[PDB]
Curated annotation (Swiss-Prot), chains A, B:
Gene: S
Superkingdom as given in the UniProt entry: Viruses
Glycosylation sites: 14
Protein function: Subunit of the fusion protein that is processed upon entry into the host cell. Mediates fusion of the virion and cellular membranes by functioning as a class I viral fusion protein. Contains a viral fusion peptide that is unmasked after S2 cleavage. This cleavage can occur at the cell membrane by host TMPRSS2 or during endocytosis by host CSTL. In either case, this triggers an extensive and irreversible conformational change that leads to fusion of the viral envelope with the cellular cytoplasmic membrane, releasing viral genomic RNA into the host cell cytoplasm.
Organism: Severe acute respiratory syndrome coronavirus 2
Residues of the whole record sequence present: 1145 to 1162 of 1273
Protein name: Spike protein S2'
Length: 18, 18
């Protein structure tokens, strides 16, 4: 669960660029 | 978990429209 949450946060931080 | 990640990716791709 923590690994999936971290991956989710990384995907959000990546999608904050456009 | 794979289906959840696939749905997350689909929602991320859909979020690019607005």
């Amino acid at each position: 669960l923590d690994s999936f949450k971290e991956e989710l946060d990384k995907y959000f931080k990546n999608h904050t660029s456009p």
